[PDB]
Design a protein around this ligand. Sequence first.
Ligand SMILES: [Mg+2]
Ligand SMILES: [Mg+2]
Ligand SMILES: [Mg+2]
Ligand SMILES: [Mg+2]
Lengths: 834, 49, 49
Amino acid sequence: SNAMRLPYSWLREVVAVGASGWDVTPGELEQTLLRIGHEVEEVIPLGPVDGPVTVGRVADIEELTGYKKPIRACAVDIGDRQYREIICGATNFAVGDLVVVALPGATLPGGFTISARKAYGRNSDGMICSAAELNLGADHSGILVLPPGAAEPGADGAGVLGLDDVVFHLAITPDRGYCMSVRGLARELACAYDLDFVDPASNSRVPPLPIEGPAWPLTVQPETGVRRFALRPVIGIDPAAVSPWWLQRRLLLCGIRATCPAVDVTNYVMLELGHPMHAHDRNRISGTLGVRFARSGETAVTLDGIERKLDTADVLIVDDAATAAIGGVMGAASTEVRADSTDVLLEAAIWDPAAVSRTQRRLHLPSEAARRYERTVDPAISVAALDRCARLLADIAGGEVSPTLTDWRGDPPCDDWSPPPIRMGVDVPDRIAGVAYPQGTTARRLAQIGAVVTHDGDTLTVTPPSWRPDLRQPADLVEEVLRLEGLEVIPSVLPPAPAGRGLTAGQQRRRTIGRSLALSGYVEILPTPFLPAGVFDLWGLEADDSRRMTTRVLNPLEADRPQLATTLLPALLEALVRNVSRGLVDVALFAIAQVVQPTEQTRGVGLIPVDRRPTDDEIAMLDASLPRQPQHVAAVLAGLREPRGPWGPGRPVEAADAFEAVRIIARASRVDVTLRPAQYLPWHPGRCAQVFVGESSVGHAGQLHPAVIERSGLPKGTCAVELNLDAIPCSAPLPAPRVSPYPAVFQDVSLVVAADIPAQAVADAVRAGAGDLLEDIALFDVFTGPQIGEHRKSLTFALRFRAPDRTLTEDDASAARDAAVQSAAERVGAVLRG
Amino acid sequence: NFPADHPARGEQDTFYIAPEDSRQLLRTHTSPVQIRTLLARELPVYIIS
Amino acid sequence: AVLPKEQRAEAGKRVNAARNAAQRSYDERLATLRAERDAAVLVAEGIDV
RNA sequence: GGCCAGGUAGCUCAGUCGGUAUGAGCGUCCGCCUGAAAAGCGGAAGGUCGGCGGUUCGAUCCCGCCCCUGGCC
Ligand SMILES: [Mg+2]
Ligand SMILES: [Mg+2]
Ligand SMILES: [Mg+2]
Ligand SMILES: [Mg+2]
């Protein structure tokens, strides 16, 4: 991840070398960090404790038997002539250990008052504390044991533990790998507070160790992308030595457990300077060290004891006998420092960031080293970090630094890690910020962050420091100036936007459709694009149904729902079931969204160079490689369509309500539709209409198939509609009605037809034969009584005739009616009722 | 400007379209709509997606 | 369950054979009746759309 | 990635390490009741106990793999 944890006391110490006496409150530090671009995830004060919390030494241990768990009655020296008798359930300590004792009257976090207790038949005069009980760390399994020599019995506990400290949890953005260390964050604060910065990696702070000869034979294949690889030995370290408390404490507050001096020092220096370090047991290295790519099918056991399957793009360190490390990710068990290790070879290497990123993600090893290397580590400080490690390890473990050094720096050797210079106008940050910064602001800020700045009239030549590979273009330098001056100085002015064209006709139509459906009683939902598992099997679709040809997601949040929706109905039906199952049984839902309908197997397009604009042919190729994604509108209904009230018991949903939804959408789109009987799952084959605009099919509506309803757990009588809005053309009619001032003639006509004849076909035939005198036609009766005959029906239409230039006689109207009757006889076989 | 094999793009966990390495995905932002508009429209562009 | 342990193996084997014979007849009859319903749904519940 | 803890009726949850979940509260249905209701009283229906296999005469329960949440890296 991007997490960086460090205690304020260490950060202040590094800042204070160049700014003696520097000290800010944690609230101000948090705001300053936020203001320059560092997100503070959490600010965690240690403690607090009050009252007698003191360092003790366990002087005797009596094992209390006969209880559930082993219990210890301990005599504890607290620095006076009366040892305290304390009961403790932990087992992770021995006689002679230093511990932290809370005596009666002490207060632990939070609000836990300590008093003498009567536990396990004994009298406990206080308690031995765990790191968690002190709010020092997370450890609660055992109690806290301070390393020998950390303090004397009787020392104030809060002072020895440094419980007045504050731990900052930061989330560092991937462009600022240099801020994953105390070095980088201290430098950032020196910039923010205009302080003089003393670099903890400089030669003044890490004086160079002697260089009298090579430390170990090494071969490096430069194709691995390694930029630097340094080695220096420390001989005769004491296996019995342990890291001092000040070092173990800082590791703990940074989230790293202490293990042994050699490993602790490499972790400590990594946190301090940002350069990962690794200690090898030199006595377990066999022959020449080699840096090379792994071969096909090669494996290696990392120091966690786990075997790793390697890739030919993985960079390794090997000797004659085995692999020594997965370069920049984790060392191997073969050369790992052990409890009896006495001679150490320290490794300071700079790996290729992309190679490490690929390797650690493939192996799922986001180690402290790997996440730093993948964000680039400063190659100029490799030997400084190495010498820092060697001197510190020799001091705390009683060893001796060997005056030998191997330092591979490429072929030819690189003696200057400066990035390429950058030319930028002196006023460029002013223009981008819209702020006239004071004279010399840009040059001063860029020098603060470590760049070399020269003036060539009005043009700056800026060479960034080696720890800032993110600075490559003038825009990168602009960000540095603007963030350090503070974005709050940037004014607020509105841009000069041109006169726009507003909403497109399609964007407008989508609003009107949504308004009309909502006003007609439908509730909009947001449909999920992932299909429920096996929904098309519930629908009984054929194996070759085009809706089954879906695009699939590689890594869905639900492994059983990888496919993307070719239809909006599954998501709507899932929301309908959610409503009905929770007591809302009368519901009408709708949705407007795109579907995903591929026309081929998933086919990708290779990378187009981003140094130029893609050609129009390359753009059409990228578009043709994507599945078709048209806009759909859909709705589902169940239960009562009209609620009960003082008017009556209401009306259950029927297929005609889905057909009316089509006509609502059509009127909102200002298009004419026709409905034709069809068979099309998941609809009921006898209650399904296919919807047409002109002769183009745009969807279906009606009642759902009863078998689909049963298998899907849907309410009986559930109805549905789905239309393809992309298949409905955007219309812009311009009517010119001519209102006739002459009276109308009203006549009704009753026609008998076969039961399978659609009523609209009869109305169409009547309209075709009646001519222009027909102003309106409306069906108001469908009769299937006994006088009609089996498989036949009588339809009665109300007709309104009106002439544009005269008053009609009844004969004129009857003549148009009779021609409509003959038209219906010829087209649908109608017989005049009689 | 997403760099390949970098935390700026690797951390961006994305719904990728099967099979692996298909260079097709569900968009993690509507920024590609802005890219398409710059390719199709004459400057200046003031666009919401 | 209340039968002696020595008799559960023999009796339980005869129960499952009879139980599976009844379950077998039910499953195919349900499928037959569902097929008839699906075959008769178009005409028996048709409407003028 | 770990050994665990969880997925049980329409909703929210109990409970069983082999032959009945004598499951609860609410939801659904019937009767008395009301012009029609509801409550009340008296009763019923509904789960194939997360999926696919295996062991077994027989698996919600035992074994394996997998899917989905929690304890947490
Ligand atoms: Mg930048
Ligand atoms: Mg449930
Ligand atoms: Mg009742
Ligand atoms: Mg009841």
